């Protein structure tokens, strides 16, 4: 239940999400591409889903990948801004869930983003505490897939 | 090209876009839904394109419409944040252009959003000068359609 999952975002979890987002969200292009390249490097079996982006190994040089990556960061910005109201968080999460359901992305595969998030956070000195907080947010999307 | 349309956005235009967005972008749920409902009221012929959202006459109560509207405002947030780097603005604009091209939305049809934007801007007392500035930003997207 996406609603029960949203209920797991306690005061402490929301605080850690906001605090870390303040840093990671400051460079959407840089960290956005970092997230995607890490996903492709650690889970090569997911590259096939991104055929529209062309050669993803080009990273920042790939205009389609850069556009996609920046936009992805605004989806996270959206989630963070909706933390105050569970009803609004759920409706935006379901909107993005549909985008992935159409691309045939399951809850299990969506969860493969946790590894990359932990790595990007770690490179900014945010440890497991923050990685686990973000895993709870990702879990809300997984509940809608 | 799209680059040309973006590179032509002057300092004065960017100033008006940012100043007005500070206001209309401050209430994404409220102004986002207002934009969509106004589009449906003045351009009823577009209602059919949004069948995935269900009964759009339900307004704010429609969770699918609310989720869509909030997300639309983040696409605008994206554009506004990329104003000073045409290269980044272009790649994000082309990304969203693809979303509409797949939905069979022509450049002329995309331009129908100018009416709703002008009305929402006016509701906050931003006049024709601001409506003209936004029309120039919409024109960047039209260059990709
Ligand atoms: C933090 C997690 C993630 C977020 C917030 C996110 C966000 C997004 C956004 C905003 C889009 C654009 C939707 C559109 O306009 O069609 C997108 C597209 C896509 N996402 Fe994700 N995504 C995430 C994780 C993943 C993962 C882990 C996979 C795959 C294992 C995945 C697969 C896809 C695919 C295949 C597309 C379509 C790309 C294209 O053809 O343009 N996403 N995602
Ligand atoms: C300020 C201008 C506009 C912006 C920034 C914008 C933004 C968006 C965004 C972000 C999406 C979601 C993309 C996706 O996840 O697939 C979307 C979907 C869509 N847009 Fe727009 N849009 C604008 C104007 C228009 C206009 C004027 C029309 C119609 C004449 C239109 C028709 C559509 C349609 C049919 C969809 C698909 C909705 C669905 O089935 O989920 N858009 N738009």
Residue nearest to atom 7 of ligand 2 (CA): B72
A54 interfacial to chain B (CB closer than 8 Å): no
Distance in angstroms (rounded) separating the CA atoms of residues A139 and A111 = 8
Tokens of B78: 């994206």
If you ran DSSP here, which 8-state letter would residue B143 be given? T
CB B32 within 8 A of CB B72: yes
The verdict on the CB of residue B70 being under 6 Å from ligand 2 is: no
Distance from CA of B16 to the nearest CA of A (A): 22
Tokens of A100: 């992935």
Which of B21, B20, B72 has its CA nearest to residue B50? Answer: B72
Residues of chain B contacting A66 with CB distance shorter than 8 Å: 88, 91
Length of chain A equals: 145
Q: How many CB atoms lie within 10 A of CB B88?
A: 21
Check A63 against B28: CB less than 8 A apart.
no
**CB under 8 Å, gap of 24 or more: what pairs does A6-14 form?**
A6/A86, A6/A89, A6/A90, A6/A93, A6/A140, A7/A86, A8/A136, A8/A139, A8/A140, A9/A83, A9/A86, A9/A89, A9/A136, A9/A137, A9/A140, A13/A133, A13/A136, A13/A137, A14/A83
The terminus-to-terminus CA distance of chain A in angstroms comes to: 10
Residues with CB under 6 A from ligand 1: A 46, 49-50, 52, 68, 71-72, 75-76, 96, 99-100, 103, 105, 109-110, 112-113, 138; B 99
Within a 13 Å sphere around the CA of B82, how many CA atoms are in the beta-carbon half? 26
Give the dihedral sign, CA B5/B10/B16/B22: positive
Distance in angstroms (rounded) separating the CA atoms of residues A54 and A62 = 8
Distance in angstroms (rounded) separating the CA atoms of residues A50 and A126 = 29
Which of B101, B70, B68, B131 has its CA nearest to residue B2? Answer: B101
Distance in angstroms (rounded) separating the CA atoms of residues A68 and A73 = 9
Distances in Å between the Cα of B122 and the Cα atoms of A56, B73, B131 are 43, 17, 8
Go through A89-111 and write b for each residue having 16 or more CB atoms within 10 A of its CB, e for each that does not.
bbbbbbbbbeebeeeebeeebbe
Distance from CA of B54 to the nearest CA of A (A): 13
Which domains are delineated in chain B?
1-145 (1.10.490.10)
Distances in Å between the Cα of B62 and the Cα atoms of A81, B50, B77, B127, B138 are 20, 13, 23, 30, 27
Distance in angstroms (rounded) separating the CA atoms of residues A77 and A35 = 15
Q: Which residues contact A16 (CB under 8 A, 6 or more apart)?
A: A129, A130, A133
Q: Which residues contact A75 (CB under 8 A, 6 or more apart)?
A: A96, B71, B74
Which of B101, B107, B102, B105 has its CA nearest to residue B141? Answer: B107
Which of B58, B84, B80 has its CA nearest to residue B69? Answer: B58
Residues of chain A contacting B30 with CB distance shorter than 8 Å: none
The verdict on the CB of residue B107 being under 6 Å from ligand 2 is: no
Please state the separation of Cα B106 from the chain's center in Å: 15
Distances in Å between the Cα of A38 and the Cα atoms of A21, A96, A103, A114, A124 are 18, 21, 20, 11, 15
Question: What is the signed CA dihedral for A28, A101, A51, B139, rounded to 10 degrees?
Answer: -60
Distance in angstroms (rounded) separating the CA atoms of residues A91 and B62 = 9
Burial class of residue A84 (count of CB atoms within 10 Å of its CB; 0-12, 13-18, 19+): exposed
Question: Residues of A at the annotated binding site for heme b?
Answer: 100
Q: How many CB atoms lie within 10 A of CB B127?
A: 11
Check B78 against A74: CB less than 8 A apart.
yes
Distances in Å between the Cα of A101 and the Cα atoms of A62, A90, A110, A141 are 25, 16, 10, 11
Tokens of B65: 């419409």
Per residue, the 3-state secondary structure of chain A, as one string, reads CHHHHHCCCCHHHHHHHHHHHHHHHHHHHHHHHHHHHHHHHHCHHHHHHHHHHCCHHHHHHCHHHHHHHHHHHHHHHHHHHCCCCHHHHHHHHHHHHHHHHCCCCCHHHHHHHHHHHHHHHHCCCCCHHHHHHHHHHHHHHHCCC
CB A82 within 8 A of CB A21: no
CB B33 within 8 A of CB B65: yes
Q: Between A52, A81, A95, which is nearest B67 by CB? A: A95
Distance from CA of A25 to the nearest CA of B (A): 12
Interface with B, mutate which of A2, A33, A92 (most B CBs under 10 A) = A92
């Amino acid at each position: 239940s996406v609603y029960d999952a949203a209920a797991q975002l306690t005061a402490d979890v929301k605080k850690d999400l906001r605090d870390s987002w303040k840093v990671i969200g400051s460079d959407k292009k840089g960290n956005g591409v970092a997230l995607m390249t890490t996903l492709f490097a650690d889970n090569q079996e997911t590259i096939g889903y991104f055929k529209r982006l062309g050669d993803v190994s080009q990273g920042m040089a790939n205009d389609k990948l850069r556009g996609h990556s920046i936009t992805l960061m605004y989806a996270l910005q959206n989630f963070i801004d909706q933390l105050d109201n569970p009803d609004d968080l759920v409706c935006v999460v379901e909107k993005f869930a549909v985008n992935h359901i159409t691309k045939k992305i399951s809850a299990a595969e969506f969860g493969k983003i946790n590894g990359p998030i932990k790595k990007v956070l770690a490179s900014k000195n945010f440890g497991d505490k923050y990685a686990n907080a973000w895993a709870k947010l990702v879990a809300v999307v997984q509940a809608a897939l």
